[PDB]
């Protein structure tokens, strides 16, 4: 009957929706198109930060990166302000997550190094976490795609599991906790007394994603990955944040 609710959302919003909530001691898994591929959009920036954290000592965060106008990618709300001054790796991580800053992500990819401007490094990092599905590359094409299951299991490991040592884990978690882009997505579907940390993605073809870790009022954590597109409507199909909020509401109803 929950499957029917998500299918109803697909009909109303004229969209493809993907959900995955890993099973825990207290709840069953929630899965809907959990093994179909969706575009990462900017959701890749959360594991990107994890990769950079994982492969470097903590002192690396203090490395100043200088860059030019030619390195600017997308809106870059933070990096647009620091062409003259540069930004530390830690500032870039912050901006990449909290503002989905595209220049920051570009530079963190470069910091990983390797072929494809760091995309091979990124993908290889995911492989190390047991994700054999996702890929980041240099509408239906498989480039730059993940699955709701794949990304949710990655996020679980990063935030709640032991993929990262405690100090690095806490940095990633805090940046996600202070995200500025996610108020109308998973956050909007969960009651106020639930804690939410998250990272968004948005694109053409009506693409809208949100990956989150939520905590019940009792302090019990769950991982929620919601992904959507409207590729049938072409490049100019509007992304629907409300779809993600309503999917999130269904999830919150199960977890309550």
Numbering used by the authors: 29 to 83, 86 to 145, 145A, 145B, 145C, 145D, 146 to 164, 174 to 238, ...
Task: Quote the authors verbatim.
BlaC is a class A serine β‐lactamase found in Mycobacterium tuberculosis (Wang et al., 2006). BlaC can efficiently hydrolyze penicillin antibiotics but has low activity against later‐generation oxyimino‐cephalosporins, such as ceftazidime, due to their bulky C7β aminothiazole‐oxyimino side chain (Sun et al., 2023; Wang et al., 2006). We analyzed the structural changes in mutants of the β‐lactamase BlaC from Mycobacterium tuberculosis obtained via directed evolution for increased ceftazidime hydrolysis activity.
At 37°C, two variants were found that were further evolved, yielding P167S/D240G/D172A/S104G/H184R (PDDSH) and P167S/D240G/I105F/H184R (PDIH) in G3, respectively. The crystal structures of BlaC variants PD, PDDS, and PDDSH were solved at 1.3, 1.6, and 1.4 Å resolution, respectively. As a consequence, the chain between residues 167 and 172 is only partially ordered, indicating mobility in this region of the Ω‐loop. Mutation H184R occurred twice, in different branches of the directed evolution experiments and in both cases causes an increase in the melting temperature, suggesting, therefore, that this mutation is generally stabilizing. An Arg at position 184 could potentially form salt bridges with Glu59 and Asp63 and a cation‐π interaction with Tyr48. The mutants selected at 37°C display more than 15‐fold increased resistance compared to PD and over 120‐fold compared to WT. For one branch of the directed evolution experiment, we managed to obtain crystal structures of the successive mutants, PD, PDDS, and PDDSH, showing the opening and increasing disorder of the Ω‐loop in an otherwise defined protein structure, suggesting minor structural changes.
